[PDB]
Amino acid sequence: MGNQQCNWYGTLYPLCVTTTNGWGWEDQRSCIARSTCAAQPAPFGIVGSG
């Protein structure tokens, strides 16, 4: 397991790489596109430990 996360201005969201083309939905929850997920500035960005 090794996916990127979306520290969304504080909250957390799973990244939607297939919907990396904007906001998407997956994992029975809402996923945020790749850059829209993490590409955002700090403290926004890729979350997770690895």
Short mmCIF file of N, CA and C in Angstrom, two decimals:
data_model
loop_
_atom_site.label_atom_id
_atom_site.label_comp_id
_atom_site.label_asym_id
_atom_site.label_seq_id
_atom_site.Cartn_x
_atom_site.Cartn_y
_atom_site.Cartn_z
N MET A 1 0.86 -1.22 0.00
CA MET A 1 0.00 0.00 0.00
C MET A 1 0.88 1.25 0.00
N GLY A 2 0.65 2.16 -0.91
CA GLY A 2 1.47 3.39 -0.96
C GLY A 2 0.77 4.44 -1.83
N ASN A 3 -0.27 5.04 -1.32
CA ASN A 3 -1.00 6.07 -2.12
C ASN A 3 -0.74 7.45 -1.51
N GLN A 4 -1.11 8.49 -2.20
CA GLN A 4 -0.88 9.87 -1.67
C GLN A 4 -2.15 10.38 -1.00
N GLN A 5 -2.02 11.31 -0.10
CA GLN A 5 -3.24 11.82 0.57
C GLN A 5 -3.41 13.31 0.37
N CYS A 6 -4.54 13.81 0.79
CA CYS A 6 -4.85 15.23 0.58
C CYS A 6 -5.04 15.97 1.88
N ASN A 7 -3.98 16.45 2.48
CA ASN A 7 -4.17 17.26 3.70
C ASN A 7 -4.97 18.45 3.21
N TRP A 8 -6.27 18.36 3.28
CA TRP A 8 -7.11 19.44 2.73
C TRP A 8 -7.21 20.59 3.71
N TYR A 9 -6.39 21.59 3.56
CA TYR A 9 -6.44 22.75 4.50
C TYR A 9 -6.73 22.28 5.94
N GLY A 10 -6.39 21.07 6.29
CA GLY A 10 -6.64 20.59 7.68
C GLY A 10 -7.28 19.20 7.66
N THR A 11 -8.31 19.01 6.89
CA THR A 11 -8.98 17.68 6.85
C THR A 11 -8.13 16.69 6.04
N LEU A 12 -8.62 15.50 5.85
CA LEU A 12 -7.85 14.48 5.08
C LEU A 12 -8.75 13.83 4.02
N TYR A 13 -8.23 13.65 2.84
CA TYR A 13 -9.03 13.01 1.76
C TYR A 13 -8.13 12.09 0.94
N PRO A 14 -8.66 10.97 0.52
CA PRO A 14 -7.90 10.01 -0.29
C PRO A 14 -7.77 10.57 -1.70
N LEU A 15 -6.62 10.46 -2.31
CA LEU A 15 -6.47 11.04 -3.66
C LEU A 15 -7.08 10.16 -4.74
N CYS A 16 -7.78 10.80 -5.62
CA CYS A 16 -8.39 10.14 -6.78
C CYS A 16 -7.46 10.34 -7.97
N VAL A 17 -6.59 9.41 -8.22
CA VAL A 17 -5.64 9.59 -9.36
C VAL A 17 -6.38 9.43 -10.69
N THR A 18 -7.34 8.56 -10.77
CA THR A 18 -8.10 8.45 -12.05
C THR A 18 -8.91 9.71 -12.20
N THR A 19 -9.37 10.24 -11.10
CA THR A 19 -10.11 11.51 -11.18
C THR A 19 -9.12 12.62 -10.84
N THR A 20 -7.87 12.38 -11.11
CA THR A 20 -6.81 13.40 -10.87
C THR A 20 -7.16 14.62 -11.70
N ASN A 21 -8.05 14.43 -12.62
CA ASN A 21 -8.51 15.51 -13.52
C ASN A 21 -9.59 16.35 -12.82
N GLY A 22 -9.39 16.63 -11.56
CA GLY A 22 -10.39 17.43 -10.79
C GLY A 22 -10.84 16.63 -9.57
N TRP A 23 -11.95 16.98 -8.98
CA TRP A 23 -12.43 16.23 -7.78
C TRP A 23 -13.12 14.94 -8.23
N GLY A 24 -12.93 13.87 -7.51
CA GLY A 24 -13.57 12.59 -7.89
C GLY A 24 -14.14 11.90 -6.65
N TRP A 25 -14.58 10.68 -6.78
CA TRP A 25 -15.13 9.95 -5.60
C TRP A 25 -14.66 8.49 -5.64
N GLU A 26 -14.23 7.97 -4.53
CA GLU A 26 -13.76 6.55 -4.50
C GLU A 26 -13.57 6.10 -3.06
N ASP A 27 -13.45 4.82 -2.83
CA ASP A 27 -13.26 4.32 -1.44
C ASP A 27 -14.53 4.60 -0.63
N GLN A 28 -15.66 4.58 -1.27
CA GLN A 28 -16.93 4.84 -0.55
C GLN A 28 -16.88 6.24 0.07
N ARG A 29 -15.96 7.05 -0.38
CA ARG A 29 -15.84 8.43 0.17
C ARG A 29 -15.47 9.38 -0.96
N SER A 30 -15.11 10.60 -0.64
CA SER A 30 -14.73 11.57 -1.71
C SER A 30 -13.21 11.57 -1.88
N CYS A 31 -12.75 11.53 -3.10
CA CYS A 31 -11.27 11.54 -3.33
C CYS A 31 -10.90 12.83 -4.06
N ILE A 32 -9.73 13.36 -3.81
CA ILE A 32 -9.32 14.62 -4.49
C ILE A 32 -8.23 14.31 -5.52
N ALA A 33 -8.39 14.82 -6.71
CA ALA A 33 -7.40 14.57 -7.79
C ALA A 33 -5.96 14.64 -7.26
N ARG A 34 -5.01 14.21 -8.04
CA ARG A 34 -3.59 14.19 -7.59
C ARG A 34 -3.11 15.58 -7.16
N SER A 35 -2.79 16.43 -8.06
CA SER A 35 -2.29 17.74 -7.63
C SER A 35 -3.35 18.44 -6.78
N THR A 36 -4.57 18.49 -7.23
CA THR A 36 -5.61 19.14 -6.39
C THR A 36 -5.50 18.55 -5.00
N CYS A 37 -5.07 17.33 -4.92
CA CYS A 37 -4.93 16.66 -3.60
C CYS A 37 -3.74 17.24 -2.89
N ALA A 38 -2.60 16.84 -3.30
CA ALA A 38 -1.37 17.27 -2.65
C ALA A 38 -0.71 18.49 -3.32
N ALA A 39 -0.72 18.57 -4.63
CA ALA A 39 -0.05 19.74 -5.29
C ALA A 39 -0.38 21.04 -4.54
N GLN A 40 -1.49 21.09 -3.86
CA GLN A 40 -1.85 22.32 -3.11
C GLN A 40 -0.68 22.74 -2.22
N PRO A 41 -0.70 23.98 -1.79
CA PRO A 41 0.37 24.53 -0.93
C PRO A 41 0.27 24.00 0.50
N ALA A 42 1.21 24.34 1.34
CA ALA A 42 1.18 23.84 2.75
C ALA A 42 0.23 24.70 3.58
N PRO A 43 -0.27 24.12 4.65
CA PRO A 43 0.04 22.73 5.04
C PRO A 43 -0.75 21.72 4.20
N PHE A 44 -1.31 22.16 3.11
CA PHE A 44 -2.09 21.23 2.24
C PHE A 44 -1.10 20.34 1.51
N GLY A 45 -1.51 19.23 0.95
CA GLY A 45 -0.48 18.42 0.22
C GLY A 45 -0.64 16.91 0.38
N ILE A 46 0.35 16.16 -0.06
CA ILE A 46 0.29 14.67 0.05
C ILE A 46 0.40 14.26 1.52
N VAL A 47 -0.53 13.49 2.01
CA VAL A 47 -0.45 13.04 3.42
C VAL A 47 -0.15 11.54 3.42
N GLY A 48 0.11 10.97 4.57
CA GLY A 48 0.42 9.51 4.62
C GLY A 48 1.79 9.30 5.26
N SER A 49 2.13 8.08 5.57
CA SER A 49 3.45 7.81 6.20
C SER A 49 4.32 7.01 5.22
N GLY A 50 3.78 5.97 4.64
CA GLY A 50 4.57 5.15 3.68
C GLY A 50 4.77 3.75 4.25
#
